[PDB]
Write a protein that binds this ligand. Structure first.
Ligand SMILES: Nc1nc2c(ncn2[C@@H]2O[C@H](COP(=O)(O)OP(=O)(O)NP(=O)(O)O)[C@@H](O)[C@H]2O)c(=O)[nH]1
Lengths: 258, 619, 180, 70
RNA sequence: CGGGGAAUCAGGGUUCGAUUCCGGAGAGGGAGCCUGAGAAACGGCUACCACAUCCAAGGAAGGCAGCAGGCGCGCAAAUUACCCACUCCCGACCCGGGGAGGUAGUGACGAAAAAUAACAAUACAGGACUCUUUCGAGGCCCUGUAAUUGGAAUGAGUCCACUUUAAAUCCUUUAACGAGGAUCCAUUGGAGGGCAAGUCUGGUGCCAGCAGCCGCGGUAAUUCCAGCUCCAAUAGCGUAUAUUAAAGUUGCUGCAGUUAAAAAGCUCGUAGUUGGAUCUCUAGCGUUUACUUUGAAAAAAUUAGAGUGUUCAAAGCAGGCCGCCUGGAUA
RNA sequence: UACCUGGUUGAUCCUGCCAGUAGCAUAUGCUUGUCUCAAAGAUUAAGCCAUGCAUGUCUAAGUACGCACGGCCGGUACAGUGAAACUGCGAAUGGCUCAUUAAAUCAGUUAUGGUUCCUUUGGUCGCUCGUACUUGGAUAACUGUGGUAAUUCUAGAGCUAAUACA
């Protein structure tokens, strides 16, 4: 069609939001921002559907327009603003801080953090370039362009940024025997340790990840995010420890709890 | 069921008793329905355009009008034209307001076959001096006398003398008294003539300000057509007459007296009905039972359309939408399936009282002389008209001219209509025609008509449609006579005139005198008794030296006959003698051929010889 | 576009041959025994059984060590033990094929209301349920085709409002009491 | 004679005395006979049968549930 | 228009897919362009072609394949309704607007649940079980074509009050009324065979008609028009027509070709298809494929299928415990 | 549920089709008590349309000398609500329909190292060596005179704004 699309049909929305069929015809339609439309989360969904604070669409803008909600220590009134992976949502009214981490089954989970941990965030560097009198530059997965990076930071490494400033505190290299998390494909939300990468020139690089419970799986390089140094994570994990336990013991656990 | 029917009838009785005992009196009366009749080109309309002050009169595509409509003048206009001469009662509270209905006048379709939907509270009769009384004017006053209603008479062409001092918008009394004396004497002489011409027709008329006593008297109001002198005097006499006479009949009560007046086919609206809403507060989205041709129809109102005030139902105007509407106006109504409906019948509006029926055999008594006389069972011509009134007019013309009609429809011509004209074509080639009056022909219909053997008679002026049809009847008679000739041999019995000069053979010149029938050229002849010997096709019949088309029942005609090419021609004396009779060769084919489509040129009272000769020829 | 679902399913299969003695008898026996309204209700239970049997049959073909067969098999058996057409002893997938229409028609609320001696005929039970006299747990049900769960069996009581149980005279008793 | 293509066909009226209810030059709905546009056991060279006459079902006129509109 | 899909179905298949999600296209037919980040835009403009509106005849103004509605076309399809409250979109914007969309009306396209009675007491030249060899004996269990007898239960309708809703409606809830031909009445097709059900009685007389097919009607019609009775499915059941299985009657699985329909009159021959044994790793390789097994990638909806008492079910994605513990799998 | 049955003969066994049987869709007939869910001018004509409505928009924050309102305080440039108009943005999304279209559309897979991109979100914005304590002219709105039968037609005259135009 002519020009860009403005709407989004409800059934055409990405599955990990878990919008039901009958509520309406349209969906939230995440607006342009740091994270991709397919792999983000509108605040209207997070507030209304996940935290169960707002009932209707009006209550969400009535919350947001009173400027009670910050994303990465910055006030956002846009109810369809895309907050994606590693983004820290802060409610300073009720003093509640959330980090958006994918759960085992492959969706953003309502994972609370201490206010002391809502100071920094981890970020995967997309590229590294230099320009105009050679001040080198870095670009990350949440589109934060940072000047004068540490020259030890190469492409596909992770960096820890203080949210109040815009400067790198510490960084993790992408090497063998490092804790990573999958952010795309069948294995989305699984945490594990790198074993090796198999470089395919002129094509996608494939990496092999071993889980804590002896489960080994492969994934594309683009869908990898280093979260810890060695085996120890630099952030809190969700309810489960990123362990994909199968339907058999899912049933056994559920029936055991009953 | 029957108990619901019983209580439905009893609650109907309650409602009409409440609507009778309601009965509001003490002033606030109903607007009278002022009817206007005439002859042909008198000035029954365009005087209304002069009353309402409308610039478009001549936009009719002809001097004549072919529909009913109500102009709907409302008090501001009455007051505006009143203040001009200012007679009586400034800002009268007692006046309902005027409602004028225009009627089309003509010789053919007998003045709209009227049946002027009655409801002619004040009938205005144009007399039009110039021409005196007219046959439609005498039959109109007979109709006005048949159902006793009060009516008045207005003159139109008073200024048309050449010598009238045209002083427009002033008193008739003044303008008449400001002329020369000889013209007044001429006007009073022709007035006396009109007064006597009404007096002889069981009336008592006079000149509108003498006595007057309009109880028995009728008011001759002189008016000018173009200038408009008398229009004030007119509306004054109308409101005076309605105030004096119609004091009790015109009560603003709450019965349901809506009457179906006209039916129209308008683009993007379906089939609309023009109704004169007199009594009954009928609501948008409320059920009505419209009396139809093929039984009654339950109709749901989509909404109420009214034309602007001081404007007619003539040209497609900006019809304003109204949700509801009080009982004093003439409005256009549209809904679902208003296809076949009857004109000049009362309209029942129904609330939710579980279907209130059976009021049709009590209406359809001796008004059956309408569209219902349709012979789908038999063959016939196809007819289409703009409005229903025009369709009735065409059908009663066909009834008078003796032609059967199969199908009828309202609105423009379509490919199904020409297909019904085509499915007729198999039966009778002549009858396969469409008579379309003042309707838009479609391209697909026209090209389908031209591709098949189906003719369409399109005409806006009805004279052209009548003339075109009659011309086609004579053209088909000519087209039938010529190219299907000499098969109708015609009955002929010849007596030989003895001692006449005989030419023997090639050709035979025979002096004869006819005894039974008449003799024309191309009739084969035979001699019986001498077996059955034949002389085929007589070529020419001549009296003395001059040629003649027919024999004069005992003429001394010398006929030139050439026998048909055979193995041998027959000879006088050898084969046939002077004593032997000459009889025409009439067969089953010839008698059947001369039976139908030969009844105008065919013999008068000599028929019997056919029955007398078919018995001896064995038929 | 409208915010409505069009997910609708047929619950009965008509027989191949319309008129066949031996069959018509067998269906009429089932109606007669369990006071069913029409042959649609027998075909409904045949269709549901057939679908369960087809699920069991298509599970058997997979190998005995397959995670999918194990999980699906256990879930099916659990549900058929839950509804009460099997027991813990006979809880093998093979035995699913050895069920029949009787086993499923026994679990109708109509049948159980008759079998527990609330109603005194199979026809009375259907009326009693439909008249809002019967209730399971604290829920007043009026569905003859309510398939009762094994653990939910031990309490089908009269709905408290009911004249039969609750203790409130109906229209007939009220009218007879006023004219008494 | 049909309405769409305007060509002539012969249609068989179904039940006893149904021909009485039809008259010449009436609007009639006709259906296929049953054998997919072929002939019938007895009647040769007809494919079609009349189902409605003058916007009224012949079954209704036969069983007397309606009357021909006049 | 193409896909996601739909109907049918052993396995293989055949047929459909204008139609709610994705992509494409066009605003009567073509063509040209202004503005803008984005248009060759039509609820923007300019011209021609076809239709057509107003008119003081000088000129002016057109685009429903948006929602209603009308005409036409035809076998074939709903209201000129109410609201931005929900789902979302647009704007300088918490505040405005939206026939996107929501809610009613018409709706036997089709799908799920489910009324039209149940129980008790009387007599059977009724049935079974016990006694007597038979006759003839019972609160052990069944039975109907009784308009016989009896109170008990009740939704359909009528109509308070709520609740529901933007406001209403429907439903659920609940006062009052409401069952003895419970006349508060179940229809649509059949009763020779296929194929479940009458060689019963009037009528007609190869006429009228029935009959998908075979056939029935010509004076005792098991088949026509009726009465009575019975059968089938049942709030539904006929009829026509496209299509699927039956059709191993399109055959890959899987058909035929002496006589049933069928092998060229005969040989050569290019393309096509098919083709005899045999051979036991040093950051680059090993002769390269097809084949087979594994891995990542592959939109939801749909389909299969886990969990969950919508009062059950078709559904829905919810829910459950006395502020909490969950789910929104999987293939 | 991997299914068959009638029909060529005096009878038989075949080949073979016609007929029956069930499902699904469009129409249509007769019938129609309760309740939930629910398709619906596609086929023929992407044929033609009266009428009404379907795209508009302001925050403390671009331009307020409309008394349209009353309010201070009375020497306070501008208290405030705010019509109108200039300015900014939107109107290229949505909705409808299936005429066109046969390696085209479209689907799965890859490429832009060969290109543009409003908006959002980051980075950058005294890095340049050469009246400023704020420069210039107009035009809407408003007032006043008009033309044409006519349209959301507009000419002439008098003032005045900027985040318009310089
Ligand atoms: N001076 C004058 N003009 C007249 C007279 N009668 C008619 N006219 C004029 O003649 C013309 C045509 O007459 P018209 O009014 O149409 O006659 P009508 O009888 O009303 N015709 P219709 O049948 O349509 O109703 C008009 O311009 C009308 O004013 C008359 O008597 N005098």
């Amino acid at each position: 069609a002519r020009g860009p699309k403005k709407h989004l049909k409800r059934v055409a929305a990405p599955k990990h939001w878990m919008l039901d069929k009958l509520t309406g015809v349209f969906a939230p339609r995440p607006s342009t921002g740091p994270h991709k439309l397919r792999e983000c989360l509108p605040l209207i969904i997070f507030l209304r559907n996940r935290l169960k604070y707002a009932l209707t669409g009006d209550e969400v803008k009535k919350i947001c327009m009173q400027r009670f909600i910050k994303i990465d220590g910055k006030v956002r009134t846009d109810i369809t603003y895309p907050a994606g992976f590693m983004d820290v949502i802060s409610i300073d009214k009720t003093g509640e801080n959330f980090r958006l981490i994918y759960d085992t089954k492959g969706r953003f989970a309502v994972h609370r953090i201490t206010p002391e941990e809502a100071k920094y965030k981890l970020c995967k560097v997309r590229k590294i370039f230099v320009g105009t009198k050679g001040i080198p530059h870095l670009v990350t997965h949440d589109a934060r362009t940072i000047r004068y990076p540490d020259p030890l930071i190469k492409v596909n490494d992770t960096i820890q940024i203080d949210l109040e400033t815009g400067k790198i505190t510490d960084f993790i290299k992408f090497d063998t025997g490092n804790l990573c998390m999958v952010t795309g494909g069948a294995n989305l939300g699984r945490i594990g340790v790198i074993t090796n990468r198999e470089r395919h020139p002129g094509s996608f690089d494939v990496v092999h990840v071993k889980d804590a419970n002896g489960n080994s799986f492969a994934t594309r390089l683009s869908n990898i995010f280093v979260i810890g140094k060695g085996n120890k994570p630099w952030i809190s994990l969700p309810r489960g420890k990123g362990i994909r336990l199968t339907i058999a013991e899912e049933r056994d656990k559920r029936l055991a709890a009953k | 069921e029957e108990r619901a029917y019983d209580k439905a009838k009893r609650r109907i009785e309650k409602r009409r008793l409440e609507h009778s005992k309601n009965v509001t009196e003490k002033d606030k009366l109903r607007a009278p329905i002022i009817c206007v009749l005439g002859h042909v080109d008198t000035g029954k309309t365009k005087i209304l355009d002069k009353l309402r002050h409308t610039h478009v009169q001549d936009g009719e595509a002809g001097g004549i009008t072919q529909q009913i409509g109500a102009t709907n003048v409302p008090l501001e206009a009455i007051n505006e034209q009143t203040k001009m001469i200012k007679n009586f009662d400034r800002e009268n509270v007692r006046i309902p307001g005027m409602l004028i209905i225009d009627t089309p006048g003509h010789e053919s379709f007998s003045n709209l076959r009227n049946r002027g939907s009655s409801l002619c509270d004040i009938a205005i009769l144009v007399v039009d001096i110039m021409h005196g009384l007219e046959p439609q004017t005498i039959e109109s006053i007979n109709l006005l006398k048949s159902k006793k209603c009060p009516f008045i008479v207005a003159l139109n062409k008073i200024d048309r003398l050449y010598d009238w001092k045209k002083s427009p918008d002033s008193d008739v009394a003044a303008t008449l008294k400001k002329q020369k004396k000889n013209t007044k004497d001429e006007f009073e002489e022709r007035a006396k003539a009109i007064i006597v011409e009404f007096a002889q027709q069981g009336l008592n008329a006079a000149l509108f300000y003498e006595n007057k006593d309009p109880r028995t008297f009728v008011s001759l109001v002189p008016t000018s057509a173009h200038t408009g002198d008398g229009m004030g005097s007119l509306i004054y006499l109308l409101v005076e007459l309605t105030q004096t006479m119609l004091s009790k009949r015109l009560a603003h009560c709450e019965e349901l007296r809506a009457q179906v007046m006209e039916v129209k086919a308008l683009p993007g609206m379906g089939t609309t009905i023009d109704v004169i809403l007199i009594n009954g507060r009928l609501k948008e989205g409320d059920t009505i039972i419209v009396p139809g041709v093929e039984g009654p129809i339950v109709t749901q109102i989509r909404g109420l359309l009214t034309p602007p005030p001081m404007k007619e139902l003539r040209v497609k105007n900006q019809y304003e939408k109204h949700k509801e509407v009080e009982a004093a106006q003439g409005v256009k109504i549209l809904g679902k399936d208003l296809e076949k409906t009857l004109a000049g019948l009362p309209l029942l509006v129904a609330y939710k009282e579980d279907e209130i029926p059976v009021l049709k055999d009590e209406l359809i008594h001796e008004l059956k002389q309408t569209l219902n006389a349709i012979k789908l069972e038999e063959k016939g011509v196809y007819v289409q008209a703009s409005t229903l009134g025009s369709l009735e007019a065409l059908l009663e013309f066909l009834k008078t001219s003796e032609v059967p009609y199969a199908g009828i429809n309202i609105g423009p011509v379509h490919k199904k209509d020409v297909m019904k004209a085509s499915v007729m074509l198999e039966h009778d080639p002549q009858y396969a025609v469409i008579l379309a009056f003042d309707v838009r022909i479609e391209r697909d219909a026209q090209e389908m008509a031209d591709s098949l053997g189906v003719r369409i008679f399109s005409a806006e002026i009805i004279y052209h449609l009548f003339d075109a049809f009659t011309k086609y009847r004579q053209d088909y008679k000519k087209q039938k006579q010529e190219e299907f000739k000499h098969i109708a041999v015609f009955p002929c019995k010849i007596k030989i005139l003895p001692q006449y000069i005989f030419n023997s053979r090639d050709p035979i010149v025979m002096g004869v005198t006819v005894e039974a029938g008449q003799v024309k050229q191309g009739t084969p002849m035979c001699v019986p008794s001498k077996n059955f010997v034949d002389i085929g096709i007589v070529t020419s019949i001549e009296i003395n030296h001059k040629q003649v088309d027919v024999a004069k029942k005992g003429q001394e005609v010398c006929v030139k006959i050439e026998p048909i090419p055979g193995e041998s021609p027959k000879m006088f004396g050898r084969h046939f003698e002077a004593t032997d009779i000459l009889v025409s060769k009439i067969s089953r084919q010839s008698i059947d051929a001369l039976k139908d489509w030969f009844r105008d040129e065919m013999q008068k009272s000599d028929w019997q010889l056919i029955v007398e000769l078919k018995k001896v020829f064995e038929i | 576009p409208v915010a409505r679902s069009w997910v609708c399913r047929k619950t009965y299969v008509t027989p191949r041959r319309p008129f066949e003695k031996s069959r018509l008898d067998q269906e009429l026996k089932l109606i007669g025994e369990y006071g069913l309204r029409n042959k649609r209700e027998v075909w409904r239970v045949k269709f549901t059984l057939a679908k369960i049997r087809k699920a069991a049959r298509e599970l058997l073909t997979l190998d005995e060590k397959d995670p999918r067969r194990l999980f699906e098999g256990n879930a099916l058996l659990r549900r058929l033990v839950r509804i009460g057409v099997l027991d813990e002893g006979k809880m093998k997938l093979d035995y699913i094929l050895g069920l029949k229409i009787e086993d499923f028609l026994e679990r109708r609320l109509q049948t159980q209301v008759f079998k527990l001696g609330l109603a005194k005929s199979i026809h009375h039970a259907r009326v009693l349920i439909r008249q809002r006299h019967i209730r399971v747990r604290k829920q007043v049900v009026n569905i003859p085709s309510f398939i009762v769960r094994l653990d939910s069996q031990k309490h089908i009581d009269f709905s408290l409002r009911s004249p039969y149980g609750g203790g409130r005279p109906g229209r007939v008793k009220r009218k007879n009491a006023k004219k008494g | 004679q049909l309405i769409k293509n305007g060509k002539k066909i012969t249609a068989f009226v179904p039940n006893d005395g149904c021909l009485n209810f039809i008259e010449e030059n009436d609007e009639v709905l006709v259906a296929g006979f049953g054998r997919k546009g072929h002939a019938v056991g007895d009647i040769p060279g007809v494919r079609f049968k009349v189902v409605k006459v003058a916007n009224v079902s012949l079954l209704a006129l036969y069983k007397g549930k309606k009357e021909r509109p006049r």
